[PDB]
Every structure is written in C-alpha cells, then in structure tokens.
Amino acid sequence: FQHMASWDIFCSVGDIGVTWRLARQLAAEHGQAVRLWVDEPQAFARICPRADPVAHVQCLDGVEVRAWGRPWAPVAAADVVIEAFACELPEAHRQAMRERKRPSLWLNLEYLSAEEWIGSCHALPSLQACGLSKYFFFPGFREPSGGLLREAGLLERRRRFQASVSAQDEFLASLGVRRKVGERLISLFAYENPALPGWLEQLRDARQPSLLLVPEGRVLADVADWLRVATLAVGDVHVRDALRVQVLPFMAQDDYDRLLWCCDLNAVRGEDSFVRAQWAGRPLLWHIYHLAKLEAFLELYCAGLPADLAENLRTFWLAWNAGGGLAGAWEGLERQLPEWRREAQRWADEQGMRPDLAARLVQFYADWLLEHHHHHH
Known about the structure:
377 residues, alpha/beta, Rossmann fold, eight-stranded mixed β-sheet, 15 helices, 18% strand, glycosyltransferase, Protein-arginine rhamnosyltransferase, EC 2.4.1.-, transferase
C-alpha cells in the first residue's frame, strides 16, 4: 500500500510548458494520479511531439492527458484541482468538486515573480461564492513562496553533462551542430525585436567568434532579413565575419535543457525556459511576453554580483526588453561573461538548495488534508 491522491490540472492556451512539467513531476516523482486538461491540443503538440492531437484521452509520461471539450463532458473531480494561470473551471467541475464527501482542494497556480509582495499572498485562501475556497499558490525565488519547479537530481545531471566534453559534443552533433575551437555558443529563443540587428552586428564585428543557434519562427525570419537570405531552413549555416548562425531543429523540453547546458549564453523566452536557463548555471537573457517583474528579478539576481557586471547586465536586459539601444551595454557585458558564468553557477546552486515547487505542492495538500480533519501534523 502507498498513499496516492488524484490531481486535475486545467490549462488554457500562460505556459503549457510549466503545466506539463509539473504534471510529469507529480506523476513520476510523487506517484500521483494526474489528469491534464488542455483546451488547445495544437498548443500541447507544440510542447509534446508524441501526442495524438485528436485523442480525447491519452497517457503520456504517466499523465492522463485529456481534451478540454466544448461542451464540457461531466466527470468526477480529483482530490486536488489546479487552475493554471487563472483559467476558469467548467461549471460542472465546480459542482463535482462540491459534491465530494471531501471537497477538492482548489488551487490557482500563479505566474512566477520575484516581487517581494507575493510572499504575503502565497497560500492565501479565498472563500468563493459556491462555498468552496481556493488557495493562491505563488512560485517564487525567496521565502515565503511556492518555490521553483526542479526535477530530482537535475543539477547533479547538469554538472556531469557540463563536465563531459564528449557528452556535449555528441548532443550538439545530434542537432547538426559542431562547435569550433574558441567559439562562444549563444542560443537565441526570443520574440521580435528591432534591436536585434544592432546586436548581430556587434557579434559580427567582435574579435572573439560566436555561434548563434536559432529556432524556426519570427526571430529567424528577422535573422534571415539581416543576413539578406530569402530562406533559412533547419541545418543552414551562414557566416558573417566573427558570427556564425545555424538553424536549430525542433527540440523537446529535455533536449532543450541539454542545449541550455552547452551554451555560454542562453537568450530565452517564456516562464518555463526562464527557470530552465537558471538551472543551467549559465548567463542568460530573458525576453518577457512586465517592468515590475523584470526589475524585481534583476534586483535579486544582481544582488550578489560585482557592481560593474550588475550595471551592464541590468542595462542590457532592460534594453533587450524595451527594444532600445543595445550597443553600450553589450560591449561591457561581453567582457564580463566569465565572471558572470561563475555567478550563474552560484545562483543555481543556491536556488538548488530550496525545496522544489512540486514538493511544496504535494506537502500543501498533505497539510491541508490533515487540517481539514483537525489532525495534528
């Protein structure tokens, strides 16, 4: 015998990547029964290639992935129901949650923020009209908060990977990529940005060579325009003096981790990859889909950095997200990449000591359950 609870996770497409990662970890590491309800199967196919876009129910990585139908097909409610990123539950599911002998624990999983105030709202109950309460669950970088998603053994695996030239070379070769000696590796997952050409020009004109790895999409179209090339296909390589550009193939989440672990600088987008780039223990650039979140993260992340690096890093990140002048900050920032890399490893190690979000979520249910029946803890 072992304890197992059931979890309903609803996501309407914040970042399906975050919800899928959480669902997988609840099933794999905690042995929970997880149903993931997705209202857009095409969005889920983006993040999970092996899925069936027409199947109403399918089991992937121990998670029961179900289509969020219109109209909603009534089902019984799980022990825990998570609304990811303030999507609205089906009316019949709220009834199902109420009808249980023990009503479902109702959680809202919030977007990640470094803002200090989320600590005052984490685990806050809110009595709803139907008579149930829902609890806000705020991921965060400091206590109190719901922590960050992080798989068991992740940093140990990352350290072994980064310590092995052959593991890195073999992985990059599986993407079609071969690093040149002395070439800095930069991954570029971003949104459209008018400041990108000025930054490409700085990479082209530098003394140290760079390899810029770019996935298909809108930014790739902008890179093609700057290259003055009509089409950029997966595997294509173009050289402009010190800058080499290569187009990446599609990558599942775990392979994207390995790419982050190889690169010397990862430009990332979206809430999931922002955290994955931090676990990589490497310099990163975050493009956000906002000023309060950006500035709050910079305050915390830069707190332990030397003043000169912190100034150039903040200036570059703010300009990267404002689309403004990038020249001055990058020149100074590029010269500080080795120092920044040592600080990025320290940051990942420090965050790695905090209990991870999935563990906090399972513990929240345990304590809630014991309190519901007025038992000791």
